[PDB]
Design an enzyme around this catalytic site. Structure first.
Site, PDB file in Angstrom:
ATOM      1  N   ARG A  79       1.074  -1.234  -0.041  1.00 11.52           N
ATOM      2  CA  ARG A  79      -0.071   0.166  -0.178  1.00 11.52           C
ATOM      3  C   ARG A  79       0.828   1.232  -0.028  1.00 11.52           C
ATOM      4  O   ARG A  79       1.904   1.380   0.580  1.00 11.52           O
ATOM      5  CB  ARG A  79      -0.919   0.055   1.341  1.00 11.52           C
ATOM      6  CG  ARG A  79      -2.020  -0.885   1.331  1.00 11.52           C
ATOM      7  CD  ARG A  79      -2.751  -0.628   2.420  1.00 11.52           C
ATOM      8  NE  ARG A  79      -2.401  -0.941   3.592  1.00 11.52           N
ATOM      9  CZ  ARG A  79      -1.987   0.038   4.577  1.00 11.52           C
ATOM     10  NH1 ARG A  79      -2.073   1.169   4.376  1.00 11.52           N
ATOM     11  NH2 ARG A  79      -1.305  -0.367   5.543  1.00 11.52           N
ATOM     12  N   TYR A 227      -1.137  -4.961  -6.108  1.00  8.27           N
ATOM     13  CA  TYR A 227      -0.920  -5.357  -4.797  1.00  8.27           C
ATOM     14  C   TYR A 227      -2.053  -5.118  -4.071  1.00  8.27           C
ATOM     15  O   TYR A 227      -2.751  -4.298  -4.002  1.00  8.27           O
ATOM     16  CB  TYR A 227       0.466  -4.804  -4.342  1.00  8.27           C
ATOM     17  CG  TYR A 227       1.081  -5.534  -3.470  1.00  8.27           C
ATOM     18  CD1 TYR A 227       1.902  -6.686  -3.799  1.00  8.27           C
ATOM     19  CD2 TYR A 227       0.942  -5.522  -1.972  1.00  8.27           C
ATOM     20  CE1 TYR A 227       2.700  -7.534  -2.793  1.00  8.27           C
ATOM     21  CE2 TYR A 227       1.735  -6.445  -1.062  1.00  8.27           C
ATOM     22  CZ  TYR A 227       2.326  -7.420  -1.629  1.00  8.27           C
ATOM     23  OH  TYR A 227       3.303  -8.248  -0.740  1.00  8.27           O
ATOM     24  N   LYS A 236      -9.358  -3.053   2.317  1.00 11.86           N
ATOM     25  CA  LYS A 236      -9.367  -1.913   2.818  1.00 11.86           C
ATOM     26  C   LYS A 236      -9.956  -0.787   2.308  1.00 11.86           C
ATOM     27  O   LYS A 236     -10.692  -0.184   3.264  1.00 11.86           O
ATOM     28  CB  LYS A 236      -7.750  -1.634   2.700  1.00 11.86           C
ATOM     29  CG  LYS A 236      -6.802  -2.461   3.068  1.00 11.86           C
ATOM     30  CD  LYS A 236      -7.121  -2.769   4.622  1.00 11.86           C
ATOM     31  CE  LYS A 236      -5.910  -3.816   5.455  1.00 11.86           C
ATOM     32  NZ  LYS A 236      -6.418  -3.735   6.879  1.00 11.86           N
ATOM     33  N   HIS A 256     -10.739  -2.105  12.308  1.00  9.69           N
ATOM     34  CA  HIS A 256      -9.547  -2.691  11.964  1.00  9.69           C
ATOM     35  C   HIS A 256      -9.313  -3.794  12.935  1.00  9.69           C
ATOM     36  O   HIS A 256      -8.202  -3.790  13.552  1.00  9.69           O
ATOM     37  CB  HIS A 256      -8.473  -1.809  11.614  1.00  9.69           C
ATOM     38  CG  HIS A 256      -7.241  -2.709  11.168  1.00  9.69           C
ATOM     39  ND1 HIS A 256      -5.943  -2.199  11.409  1.00  9.69           N
ATOM     40  CD2 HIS A 256      -6.814  -3.552  10.394  1.00  9.69           C
ATOM     41  CE1 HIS A 256      -5.007  -2.665  10.572  1.00  9.69           C
ATOM     42  NE2 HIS A 256      -5.785  -3.731  10.051  1.00  9.69           N
ATOM     43  N   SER A 278      -0.782  -2.392  11.953  1.00  6.16           N
ATOM     44  CA  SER A 278      -0.576  -3.140  10.804  1.00  6.16           C
ATOM     45  C   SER A 278       0.915  -3.957  10.810  1.00  6.16           C
ATOM     46  O   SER A 278       1.192  -4.968  10.236  1.00  6.16           O
ATOM     47  CB  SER A 278      -0.624  -2.302   9.335  1.00  6.16           C
ATOM     48  OG  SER A 278      -1.778  -1.832   9.234  1.00  6.16           O
ATOM     49  N   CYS A 280       1.924  -6.529  12.551  1.00  5.86           N
ATOM     50  CA  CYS A 280       1.147  -7.355  12.838  1.00  5.86           C
ATOM     51  C   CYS A 280       1.097  -8.021  14.131  1.00  5.86           C
ATOM     52  O   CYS A 280       1.622  -7.241  15.243  1.00  5.86           O
ATOM     53  CB  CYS A 280       1.006  -8.355  11.655  1.00  5.86           C
ATOM     54  SG  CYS A 280      -0.709  -9.262  11.535  1.00  5.86           S
ATOM     55  N   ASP A 303      -8.470  -9.578  10.397  1.00  3.26           N
ATOM     56  CA  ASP A 303      -8.195  -8.393  10.242  1.00  3.26           C
ATOM     57  C   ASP A 303      -9.118  -7.384  10.171  1.00  3.26           C
ATOM     58  O   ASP A 303      -9.056  -6.322  10.497  1.00  3.26           O
ATOM     59  CB  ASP A 303      -7.859  -8.306   8.606  1.00  3.26           C
ATOM     60  CG  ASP A 303      -6.878  -7.339   8.136  1.00  3.26           C
ATOM     61  OD1 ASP A 303      -6.436  -6.449   8.727  1.00  3.26           O
ATOM     62  OD2 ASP A 303      -7.391  -6.714   6.771  1.00  3.26           O
ATOM     63  N   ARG A 394       3.360 -12.012   1.130  1.00  2.00           N
ATOM     64  CA  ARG A 394       1.954 -12.980   1.555  1.00  2.00           C
ATOM     65  C   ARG A 394       1.603 -14.039   1.182  1.00  2.00           C
ATOM     66  O   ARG A 394       1.963 -14.699   0.164  1.00  2.00           O
ATOM     67  CB  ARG A 394       0.899 -11.715   0.890  1.00  2.00           C
ATOM     68  CG  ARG A 394       0.896 -10.303   1.279  1.00  2.00           C
ATOM     69  CD  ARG A 394       0.289  -9.960   2.458  1.00  2.00           C
ATOM     70  NE  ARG A 394       0.829  -8.900   2.987  1.00  2.00           N
ATOM     71  CZ  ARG A 394       0.371  -8.158   4.159  1.00  2.00           C
ATOM     72  NH1 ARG A 394      -0.793  -8.590   4.982  1.00  2.00           N
ATOM     73  NH2 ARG A 394       0.735  -7.253   4.725  1.00  2.00           N
TER      74      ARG A 394
HETATM   75  O1  NTM Z   1      -2.782  -3.587   3.327  1.00  2.00           O
HETATM   76  C1  NTM Z   1      -2.038  -4.421   3.856  1.00  2.00           C
HETATM   77  O2  NTM Z   1      -1.011  -4.225   3.988  1.00  2.00           O
HETATM   78  C2  NTM Z   1      -2.490  -5.319   4.772  1.00  2.00           C
HETATM   79  C3  NTM Z   1      -3.171  -6.635   4.246  1.00  2.00           C
HETATM   80  C4  NTM Z   1      -3.711  -7.459   5.010  1.00  2.00           C
HETATM   81  C5  NTM Z   1      -4.045  -7.401   6.251  1.00  2.00           C
HETATM   82  N1  NTM Z   1      -3.642  -6.069   6.913  1.00  2.00           N
HETATM   83  C6  NTM Z   1      -3.241  -5.243   6.059  1.00  2.00           C
HETATM   84  C7  NTM Z   1      -2.775  -4.203   6.672  1.00  2.00           C
HETATM   85  O3  NTM Z   1      -1.932  -3.305   6.540  1.00  2.00           O
HETATM   86  O4  NTM Z   1      -3.417  -3.891   7.783  1.00  2.00           O
HETATM   87 MN    MN Z   2      -4.972  -5.241   8.325  1.00  2.00          MN
END
Ligand code: NTM
Ligand code: MN
Ligand code: MN
Ligand code: NA
Length: 605
Positions: A79, A227, A236, A256, A278, A280, A303, A394
């Site tokens: 992102r 992506y 998202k 979230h 994020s 994680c 998530d 991923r």
């Molecule tokens: O967009 C992401 O990288 C993402 C992908 C899966 C779960 N969470 C996220 C996050 O940033 O919170």
């Molecule tokens: Mn997430």
């Protein structure tokens, strides 16, 4: 005008009028060679994968049952917040107007600027490519909490991933009917004939990448990136950004948060939700293997959570997703054995390393390779233990394959949330667990979240929503607080956790992993009204010997629950200035009040 001649699956005639218009209007604009209306079938899925394989877009992983590997352009691997925008008439509706600096809580773009950006990107953008029409539901098909989208995309990779990450296909169309839907438009931005070189057979356009949300038009428009977070528009873009705005309008919550169910040794089950940055640790807790005898943990989601108080005042949560798009590196039998079982079938991997026998590999996998087995990195070079997998690499796997998926994970009425957990990466000062003194204090705890990034930096990430607010964060806070005045609302207990606390030497004070079940036991008991808490200035902590520490040996509970006046003075000061700057005129009275009260309790230490 009429694109019927270019449909290679399904029928324009058979679509609902407003779905036909969306498809056709965008076919006229983007100029796809073909239109493919997705049915969501296995036949469709298997054949699209085989075709991506033909064109070098993905590689099959021969070691596993129907698993695949995509390696991307190094420029398109995450992102991009600086290119992620929300369009509204007034900036202030999207982000609070900061007092002194630039806003960290969102990015506004005017309608006028966006229209220019759109016009400079989308015309002709799909020339020579197939436009895939993806009908998808976010949430269990029958759920009154579920919401339907149509995503148009020119990426087969996005199609396959959306089949996993959402409920996708013909049945969604039949359910939708003449109802409303989120209009989702995506293109990789590489019309044929290609203007620019293709890197690693991964079509993208970094220079023109733009992920836009227009809540008032119910449209998500995303250009230039394939992506996940940028291209899986249900996740998202829809399920946090658009949905949090809808949630505010309609009186529910889009958050979230992971959702898990936890059962004690006397058969009683509770559902909990948790928001972590994020950076994680969410998927680990959601799929935790509890060490405590007689306890069970089951996964509803890892998530996103859509939550609504029901007529009885219970806060009901659903997972709007259909799969797990988790971070691969760091995932091991030790950290998440349930994740390892899930991803050995029907799973699409992106930007991880490949072993010579067709397996997957990443940093922190902690599985020795037999002598003879060599490794090809995510960049398609032979690799020797530069990281073999991209750190944001991923796996994309069906939720139904999780061996501890909760038996109520698709229940249309959702599951009743009795606790909400916030937390972050704090090496110093923040106890292992504490409990907010009230709902208002609990909302302040979420608002105050900080976490160490990966010299170190500690950043604010309020509610774990910093990249995801659909609208003004001040109004978001006001929305949370309003729940205290809802008719029969049974407000859940709010907790805060820190797995990351270190001693003087830099060593973690808590072992974590499945031992986090011990903290969950305490939460459980407090929800039951147990007298297991001690009052401190920051909230309630477990009182002497309240935790189950058996089988751990000598954990240093003094340091692990140590609260220093000098640290917390510094903490409230820093939070004060953050909220004043970033939320400013939109900071609710009650949050300023909690701030003052915390400052006051600290000063009396
Ligand atoms: O967009 C992401 O990288 C993402 C992908 C899966 C779960 N969470 C996220 C996050 O940033 O919170
Ligand atoms: Mn997430
Ligand atoms: Mn109030
Ligand atoms: Na590739």
């Amino acid at each position: 005008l009429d694109f019927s001649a270019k449909v290679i699956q399904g029928s324009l005639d058979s679509l609902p009028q407003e779905v036909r218009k969306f498809v056709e209007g965008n076919a006229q604009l983007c100029q796809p060679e073909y239109i493919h209306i997705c049915d969501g079938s296995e036949e469709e899925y298997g054949r699209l994968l085989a075709h991506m394989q033909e064109e070098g877009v993905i590689r099959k992983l021969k070691k596993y049952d129907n698993c695949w590997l995509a390696l991307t352009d190094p420029r398109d691997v995450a992102r991009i917040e600086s290119k992620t925008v929300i369009i509204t008439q007034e900036q202030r509706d999207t982000v609070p107007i900061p007092k002194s600096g630039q806003s960290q809580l969102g990015r506004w773009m005017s309608e006028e600027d966006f229209e220019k950006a759109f016009n400079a990107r989308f015309p002709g953008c799909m020339k020579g490519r197939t436009m895939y029409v993806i009908p998808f539901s976010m949430g269990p098909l029958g759920s009154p909490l579920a919401k339907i989208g149509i995503e148009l995309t020119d990426s087969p990779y996005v199609v396959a991933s959306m089949r996993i990450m959402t409920r996708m296909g013909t049945s969604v169309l039949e359910a939708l009917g003449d109802g409303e839907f989120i209009k989702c438009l995506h293109s990789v931005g590489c019309p044929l004939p290609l203007k620019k070189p293709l890197v690693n057979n991964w079509a993208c356009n970094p220079e023109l990448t733009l992920i836009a949300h227009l809540p008032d038009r119910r449209e998500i428009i995303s250009f230039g990136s394939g992506y996940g977070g940028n291209s899986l528009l249900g996740k998202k873009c829809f399920a946090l950004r658009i949905a949090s705005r809808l949630a505010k309008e309609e009186g529910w919550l889009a958050e979230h948060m992971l959702i898990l169910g936890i059962t004690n040794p006397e058969g009683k089950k509770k559902y909990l939700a948790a928001a972590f940055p994020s950076a994680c640790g969410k998927t680990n807790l959601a799929m935790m293997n509890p060490t405590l005898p007689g306890w069970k943990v089951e996964c509803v989601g890892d998530d996103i959570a859509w939550m609504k108080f029901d007529a009885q005042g219970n806060l009901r949560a659903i997972n709007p997703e259909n799969g797990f798009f988790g971070v691969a590196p760091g995932t091991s039998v030790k950290t998440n054995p349930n994740a390892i079982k899930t991803i050995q079938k029907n799973t699409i991997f992106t930007n991880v390393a490949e072993t010579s026998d067709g397996g997957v590999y990443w940093e922190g996998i902690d599985e020795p390779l037999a002598p003879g087995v060599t490794i090809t990195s995510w960049k398609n070079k032979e690799w020797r233990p530069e990281p073999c997998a991209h750190p944001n690499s991923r796996f994309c796997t069906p939720a139904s394959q999780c061996p501890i998926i909760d038996p109520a994970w698709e229940s249309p009425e959702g599951v009743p949330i009795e606790g909400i957990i916030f937390g972050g990466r704090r090496p110093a000062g923040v106890p292992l667990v504490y409990e907010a003194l009230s709902w208002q204090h609990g909302v302040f705890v979420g608002a105050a979240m900080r976490s160490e990034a990966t010299g170190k930096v500690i950043m604010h990430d309020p509610f774990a929503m910093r990249p995801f607010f659909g609208y003004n964060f001040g109004k978001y806070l006001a929305h949370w607080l309003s729940m205290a005045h809802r008719p029969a609302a049974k407000l859940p207990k709010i907790f805060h956790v820190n797995w990351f606390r270190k001693d003087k030497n830099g060593k973690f004070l808590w072992p974590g992993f499945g031992e986090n079940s011990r903290v969950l036991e305490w939460m459980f008991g407090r929800i039951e009204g147990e007298d297991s808490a001690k009052l401190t200035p920051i909230g309630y902590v477990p009182k002497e010997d309240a935790l189950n520490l058996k089988g751990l040996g000598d954990v240093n509970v003094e340091e692990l629950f140590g609260i220093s006046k000098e640290f917390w003075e510094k903490e409230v000061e820093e939070i004060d200035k953050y909220l004043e700057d970033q939320v400013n005129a939109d900071l609710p009275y009650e949050i300023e009040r909690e701030l003052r009260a915390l400052k006051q309790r600290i000063s009396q230490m």
